[PDB]
């Protein structure tokens, strides 16, 4: 029997949340993924864990209507950033801090930041994305940052393994 955990996939519109989930669940890269106009629900299993992926649209309208509930009901949060869109790093930092770092509804749950689109020539490194999001100023929450690509699959297995390990560690430490 597997334990069900709900994971909220958040991040700005165009960050690559839906494309990463498609690469993991279908094994294929879609370079023409369409904007999510609400919620996509998908599943993937990794060992004793059934991951229920809540892929929420990142457009402003969906942050204000849907993000609060799915973030508050999740067991883990994945915040995806387009590393090749530095014109939106300040906006991505603002939303990460409002909806995750300083959101009182987020307890001591796993927080994984994915610095996505590493395959693109203008992609900033994981270190550069961490500094742009002020991750080095996060004082009370644990977090991980992983550079990845839905196009090549780079680090997607390792990122999912990190989440499975953190969720399993919480279960084992409590027992
Ligand atoms: N080259 C490249 N393109 C990517 C990658 N991830 C996503 N894309 C592309 O980036 C665009 C936006 O990806 P989406 O998956 O729709 O982004 P999203 O975060 O789900 O956006 P919303 O649905 O608006 O929340 C699409 O054209 C994707 O094909 C990646 O790692 N590399
Ligand atoms: Mg989407």
Automatic annotation (TrEMBL):
Mg(2+) 2 binds at residues 18, 55. Keywords: GTP-binding, Metal-binding, Nucleotide-binding. GDP binds at residues 15-19, 116-117, 119, 150-151. GTP binds at residues 16-19, 30-31, 36, 58, 116-117, 119, 150-151. Mg(2+) 1 binds at residues 18, 36. This is Mutual gliding-motility protein MglA. It comes from Candidatus Heimdallarchaeota archaeon LC_3. The lineage of its organism: Archaea, Promethearchaeati, Candidatus Heimdallarchaeota.
